Design a protein around this ligand. Structure first.
Ligand SMILES: *[C@@H]1O[C@H](CO)[C@@H](O[C@@H]2O[C@H](CO)[C@@H](O)[C@H](O)[C@H]2NC(C)=O)[C@H](O)[C@H]1NC(C)=O
Ligand SMILES: *[C@@H]1O[C@H](CO)[C@@H](O[C@@H]2O[C@H](CO)[C@@H](O)[C@H](O)[C@H]2NC(C)=O)[C@H](O)[C@H]1NC(C)=O
Ligand SMILES: *[C@@H]1O[C@H](CO)[C@@H](O[C@@H]2O[C@H](CO)[C@@H](O)[C@H](O)[C@H]2NC(C)=O)[C@H](O)[C@H]1NC(C)=O
Ligand SMILES: *[C@@H]1O[C@H](CO)[C@@H](O[C@@H]2O[C@H](CO)[C@@H](O)[C@H](O)[C@H]2NC(C)=O)[C@H](O)[C@H]1NC(C)=O
Ligand SMILES: *[C@@H]1O[C@H](CO)[C@@H](O[C@@H]2O[C@H](CO)[C@@H](O)[C@H](O)[C@H]2NC(C)=O)[C@H](O)[C@H]1NC(C)=O
Ligand SMILES: *[C@@H]1O[C@H](CO)[C@@H](O[C@@H]2O[C@H](CO)[C@@H](O)[C@H](O)[C@H]2NC(C)=O)[C@H](O)[C@H]1NC(C)=O
Ligand SMILES: *[C@@H]1O[C@H](CO)[C@@H](O)[C@H](O)[C@H]1NC(C)=O
Ligand SMILES: *[C@@H]1O[C@H](CO)[C@@H](O)[C@H](O)[C@H]1NC(C)=O
Ligand SMILES: *[C@@H]1O[C@H](CO)[C@@H](O)[C@H](O)[C@H]1NC(C)=O
Ligand SMILES: *[C@@H]1O[C@H](CO)[C@@H](O)[C@H](O)[C@H]1NC(C)=O
Ligand SMILES: *[C@@H]1O[C@H](CO)[C@@H](O)[C@H](O)[C@H]1NC(C)=O
Ligand SMILES: *[C@@H]1O[C@H](CO)[C@@H](O)[C@H](O)[C@H]1NC(C)=O
Lengths: 244, 366
């Protein structure tokens, strides 16, 4: 259940420097005050990320998704290949009290929005769901710079996340914050494209502050530093400079 | 030992290394997370009513731990014919999905549910492939299904034009035509009904008595396997060289208490050259510490076989706490070089005769 609209929203897909964001713990090992070199999929330093203010974007290897959000306007994500009834698809939402993850192969429509009523009761993202397998529920994920890394390897979907109190106006901060493993999921899909879910007030849709940043991962070698407590404090990209 | 290693019947004054020494592991321990998320076998084997064979009820089992031992050892099963694998080893290997097919049949027809079998039920209502891997359970259910007036709720496709491929459910209600006389969905010259009911009664003889049947089929598709049997864990000991299997990470050593502090998501630690040094037990979530149990060479101090015949023994770099006939022997002394038995310490000082190490050496006087 969804309808089209005349006010065809479009986003100012500007570009921004990546700086040194998008670092996550690669495994579960503990190391104290040591420098460790690892080869894996990362977000290269000082690259260009695409800034938006809803397209279907390629997944490629993995994605890095950031939002300088206030009041948590964004809701969820949808992953898959064809996003129809024919092929298996993945959905993730977070309404108000818990994250809901489904691997249900339902089909969507042109406009995948949630909508709220002003005691909220509104959900018409998709229409029909015939076959499906997996389900999962957990605690909610979400001024607030939220960073997420989505990866999918070897039939396993991995999600890393981090939250930061941001004070700068619009650009990404020039700081360092490693991303911690949030969750792992044992599902075999061939995700290649995805989208983004939006929440708008309905009573008059008001969805204009859709400001976020998207970037892509590539394989490379990094050098990480672990302090005494075993947390990552600094990293060095390797194929960036002769000095590196 | 010195004579054998040196390959001579006479040995001169000196110190020689003969062999090694190492503490042997005492016993083995295994640790694993708490057993939880048991597969809901209860709602199948204890369902109020079952489905008929021609519409056999299929359920999917995934993302849980399944314990077949409680079913296997259970003596309430009149028939447990389990073909795909050995049931005893069933708790070990595991798959990515399970299918439970439940229904009710007659006593004699039970033998038809097997690979390479034919018959009414084996061909017209539910078919098993010749290569079927799985495990079939059947038990008498006279006290439930049988009714004094005769239960007729269970039906089976008595008549059908064509046979059934493995795992092929068909609920078609076509009026079967025996001959060439057409029927517009009605009975007549050669037109009958494919489905016929059972007449279960309490006084029906055995074999004509209702038996409830569940077939478990194992699916091993390339997706990650989520259904596996429970892992048995044991108690944990400390301060003893043992071999351990912490959540699949195996190795030998002695386990002590550690004051390290992991972040809430690490599991184990290593320092340099990737050697594990600390583990977090899945059940208590407290950081332990691993240390290799002691080892080192042994050496024999002799004054020359021509002079005397008694010797002393040095265990190199071994604390004089776990030495073990030469377990006590003579006065035992502890040095930076190791532990020394068969010799006695003095507070004099002479020129070095047989260098032992760390600034001390021995001579014959005893
Ligand atoms: C967010 O969505 C989930 C998924 O629908 C809701 O979870 C349901 O909550 C109700 C009542 O709390 C339960 O009866 C259902 O069993 C839950 N699951 C489903 C699939 O419906 C959750 O309530 C929603 N959050 C809010 C604030 O309404
Ligand atoms: C659910 O999945 C089943 C099995 O995959 C579908 O049933 C048949 O599936 C095969 C394999 O793709 C198709 O060739 C058949 O056409 C399917 N049968 C029908 C009647 O469509 C089934 O279609 C799927 N959807 C539902 C609602 O059951
Ligand atoms: C490392 O972990 C410790 C333990 O929580 C953090 O707390 C410090 O602990 C030391 C004692 O070991 C105190 O002297 C500090 O005053 C504590 N600091 C705070 C802010 O509580 C410590 O902050 C962590 N980080 C570092 C770099 O040590
Ligand atoms: C099906 O139900 C029977 C009887 O209710 C179970 O057998 C016993 O059930 C009682 C509870 O009524 C337990 O206290 C016993 O431990 C059970 N005996 C065992 C486990 O050997 C039977 O376990 C049930 N089957 C399933 C799969 O849940
Ligand atoms: C796993 O099982 C153990 C054993 O019951 C749990 O440890 C108990 O935890 C409670 C607190 O919830 C304590 O009151 C008990 O004294 C503990 N018992 C023992 C033997 O340690 C443990 O909480 C369970 N969960 C996990 C994640 O280990
Ligand atoms: C050999 O082992 C013994 C026993 O572990 C050591 O004696 C311990 O010494 C420490 C510190 O000197 C004390 O805290 C312990 O209480 C002692 N234990 C006992 C049982 O007395 C001894 O130090 C070890 N030898 C060497 C050279 O390290
Ligand atoms: C039309 O859409 C744009 C972009 O989404 C938004 O900024 C604007 O407020 C919308 N206007 C109305 C009347 O909805
Ligand atoms: C990112 O792309 C934009 C336009 O595609 C370009 O202007 C910018 O220099 C790029 N950033 C780099 C290469 O770091
Ligand atoms: C937003 O940032 C604050 C820190 O200023 C933090 O306490 C809070 O948990 C963050 N919110 C979310 C949803 O992460
Ligand atoms: C999906 O991925 C599997 C894994 O290799 C592959 O066998 C299958 O052909 C893929 N299906 C596509 C790309 O449609
Ligand atoms: C052993 O020592 C004695 C005393 O000096 C000497 O007479 C004898 O020849 C020695 N024998 C050998 C085999 O060295
Ligand atoms: C040697 O001196 C130590 C003190 O340095 C003393 O304890 C010991 O009794 C003395 N005698 C021997 C045989 O070690």
């Amino acid at each position: 259940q969804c309808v089209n609209f005349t006010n065809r929203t479009q986003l100012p897909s500007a570009y921004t420097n990546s700086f040194t964001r998008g670092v996550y713990y690669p495994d579960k090992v503990f190391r104290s005050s040591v420098l460790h070199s690892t080869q894996d999929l990362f977000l290269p330093f000082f690259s260009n990320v695409t800034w938006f203010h809803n397209p279907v974007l390629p997944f490629n290897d993995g994605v890095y998704f950031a939002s300088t959000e206030k009041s948590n306007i964004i809701r969820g994500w949808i992953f898959g290949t064809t996003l129809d009834s024919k092929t298996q698809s993945l959905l993730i939402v977070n309404n108000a009290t818990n994250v809901v993850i489904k691997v249900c192969e339902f089909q969507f429509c042109n406009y995948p929005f949630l909508g709220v009523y002003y005691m909220e009761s509104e959900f018409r993202v998709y229409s029909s769901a015939n076959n499906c397998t997996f389900e999962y529920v957990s605690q909610p994920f979400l001024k607030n710079l939220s960073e997420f890394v989505f990866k999918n390897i070897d039939g396993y979907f991995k999600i890393y996340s981090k939250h930061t109190p941001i004070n700068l106006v619009r650009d990404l901060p020039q700081g360092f914050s490693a991303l911690e493993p949030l969750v792992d999921l044992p599902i075999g899909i061939n995700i290649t494209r995805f989208q983004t879910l939006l929440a708008l007030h309905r009573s008059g849709w008001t969805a204009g502050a859709a400001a976020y940043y998207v970037g892509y991962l590539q394989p490379r070698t990094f050098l990480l530093k672990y302090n005494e407590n075993g947390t990552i404090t600094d990293a060095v990209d390797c194929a960036l400079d002769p000095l590196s | 030992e010195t004579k054998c290693t040196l390959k001579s019947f006479t040995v001169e004054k000196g110190i020689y290394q003969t062999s090694n020494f190492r503490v042997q592991p005492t016993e083995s321990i295994v640790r694993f997370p708490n057993i939880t998320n048991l597969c809901p076998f209860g709602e199948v084997f204890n369902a109020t009513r079952f489905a008929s064979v021609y519409a056999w009820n299929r359920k999917r089992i995934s993302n849980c731990v399944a314990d077949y031992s409680v079913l296997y050892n259970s003596a309430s099963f009149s028939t447990f014919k389990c073909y795909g694998v050995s049931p005893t080893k069933l708790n070990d290997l595991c798959f990515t999905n399970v299918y439970a097919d439940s229904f009710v049949i007659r006593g004699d027809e039970v033998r038809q549910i097997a690979p390479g079998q034919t018959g009414t039920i084996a061909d017209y209502n539910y078919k098993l492939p010749d290569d079927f891997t799985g495990c079939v359970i059947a038990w008498n259910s006279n006290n439930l299904d049988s009714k004094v007036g005769g239960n007729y709720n269970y039906l089976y496709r008595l008549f059908r034009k064509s046979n059934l491929k493995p795992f092929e459910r068909d609920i078609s209600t076509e009026i079967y035509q025996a001959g060439s006389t057409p029927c517009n969905g009605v009975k007549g010259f050669n037109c009958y009904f494919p489905l016929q009911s059972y007449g279960f009664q309490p006084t029906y003889g055995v074999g004509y008595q209702p038996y409830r049947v569940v077939v478990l089929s194992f699916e091993l598709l390339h997706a990650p396997a989520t259904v596996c049997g429970p892992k048995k864990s044991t108690n944990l000991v400390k301060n003893k060289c043992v071999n351990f299997n912490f959540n699949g990470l195996t190795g030998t050593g002695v386990l002590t208490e550690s004051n390290k502090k992991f972040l809430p998501f690490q599991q184990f630690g290593r320092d340099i050259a990737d050697t594990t040094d600390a583990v977090r037990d899945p059940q208590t979530l407290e950081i332990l510490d691993i240390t290799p149990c002691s080892f080192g060479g042994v050496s024999v101090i002799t004054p020359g076989t021509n002079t005397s015949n008694q010797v002393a023994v040095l265990y190199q770099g071994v604390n004089c706490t776990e030495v073990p006939v030469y377990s006590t022997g003579s006065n035992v002394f502890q040095t930076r070089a190791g532990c020394l038995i068969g010799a006695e310490y003095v507070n004099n000082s002479y020129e070095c005769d047989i260098p032992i190490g760390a600034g001390i050496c021995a001579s014959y006087q005893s």
